[PDB]
């Protein structure tokens, strides 16, 4: 174990996505802070807004 910079974020990338559907909030981001923002929170926002775009009821 040496290249563990990417490791916890590589999986945070997937975890964040799931956290969008299952985790509800960003409160459940138990990996890195800043680097997890760009990884974990990236998938988090994506997952939500993807299922969010499906609810195109209003134009607003």
From TrEMBL:
Any single GO CC term annotated in Swiss-Prot or TrEMBL for this entry: cytoplasm
Record keyword Cell inner membrane present: no
Pfam families found in the cross-reference section: RMF
Keywords, alphabetical: Cytoplasm, Translation regulation
Main location: cytoplasm
Locations listed in the record: Cytoplasm
InterPro entries: Ribosome_modulation_factor (IPR007040), RMF_sf (IPR023200)
Biological processes, Gene Ontology terms: regulation of translation
Region (Disordered), start-end ranges: 1-25
HAMAP family: RMF
Function noted in UniProt: During stationary phase, converts 70S ribosomes to an inactive dimeric form (100S ribosomes).
NCBIfam families: PRK14563.1, Rmf_CrpP_fam
Protein family membership: Belongs to the ribosome modulation factor family.
Protein name according to UniProt: Ribosome modulation factor
Lineage: Bacteria, Pseudomonadati, Pseudomonadota, Gammaproteobacteria, Vibrionales
